[PDB]
Amino acid sequence: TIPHLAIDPFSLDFFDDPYPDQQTLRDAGPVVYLDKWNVYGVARYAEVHAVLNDPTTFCSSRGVGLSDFKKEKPWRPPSLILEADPPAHTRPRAVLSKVLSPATMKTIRDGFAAAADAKVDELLQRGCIDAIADLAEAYPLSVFPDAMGLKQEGREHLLPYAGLVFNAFGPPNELRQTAIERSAPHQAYVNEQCQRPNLAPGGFGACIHAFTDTGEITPDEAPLLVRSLLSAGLDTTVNGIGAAVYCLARFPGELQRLRSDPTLARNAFEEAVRFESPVQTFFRTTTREVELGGAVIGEGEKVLMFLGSANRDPRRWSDPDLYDITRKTSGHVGFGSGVHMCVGQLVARLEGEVMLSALARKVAAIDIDGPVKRRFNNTLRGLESLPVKLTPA
């Protein structure tokens, strides 16, 4: 009753061009079985959204990667937020929601916007740059570690650690084994910075520790919550901003509409998140036998959600393959949906908005002018190198 497919959604050939395989996954049925990894898969919008919003059956406390924490040891202590279910999830989630709250955004907006404007002006003096190293990576590196309150020493470990985290959600393929092997130095750096004495007062990390006073989290929980921000908060935005720049480079008509109304910057970024879906996939584990899409899934089974596919499902989206900065993006699943929906979404949108605003006001054209190279990761979709020539407005 359930179709069995041999597609490996963690293979390099899949990463290189996922869209044909994603349609095959959608059109095979509402639920598929992936023989390569012995997991169920859902790739249509309706089922992905349903699974995300059914946490009591599709749980996260057994891991949101392929590995089932009931069967194997986690490669690092479980995240207290991503890898927890309610009620354990609730108070840690509330702490991060307050640390990264609307009110908090007021305190960082001016500096984040100023750093974006300065970066774009700097790049316009060079003309010819790598939109990944020089923009998608350089900008978040210039604002986020400081907003976290990290010291200067050791920051070279941040992107390597995040790449490890996202590779580790995948299956035990070469990408994952190479990332986990000899990762101790990255783990040691991050774990050290999560301790209270190493976090600058006023930054996100120190603010997490300050919540230990309220009874929402204990002091021994705070380092792990800081770890969540250092795991999710940098590499995601790197690939989100890179996706937006890649979209604007490929769709000059949309760059021109953004230039004509810079207030579209926030939605242009949201549409880039839908269109590229920097976080491609996450898993859940069934807590009971459950019927999904006419398929009877047993207890304790991994279910792979194709977020990028759901964001391109023509059952839900008009012209899903087109980048449209005025699209009504509400309901996309690029930040998840439901109890675990990205708690850092306001930071991500702030960075993306202010960068796209700076481009909208300062740049007239973005031309790819060198070999484009893709970056392979079991969970993240994005580019390794995007050589572009920026023409000033």
Ligand code: HEM
């Ligand atoms: C474009 C950028 C980003 C994307 C595409 C993204 C994507 C996601 C997705 C899909 C989830 C849901 C996980 C699940 O359902 O299992 C999530 C959760 C989460 N994100 Fe983001 N994220 C981004 C930026 C950030 C930033 C900047 C931060 C921190 C500053 C952050 C921190 C978190 C945390 C802690 C969670 C777990 C929340 C929970 O389990 O309740 N993310 N993110």
Ligand SMILES: O=C(O)c1ccc(Cl)cc1
């Ligand atoms: O480490 C964490 O909690 C974590 C890691 C990655 C994401 Cl996308 C969200 C949360």
Ligand SMILES: [Cl-]
């Ligand atoms: Cl760690």
Ligand SMILES: [Mg+2]
């Ligand atoms: Mg260990």
Ligand SMILES: [Mg+2]
């Ligand atoms: Mg010290």
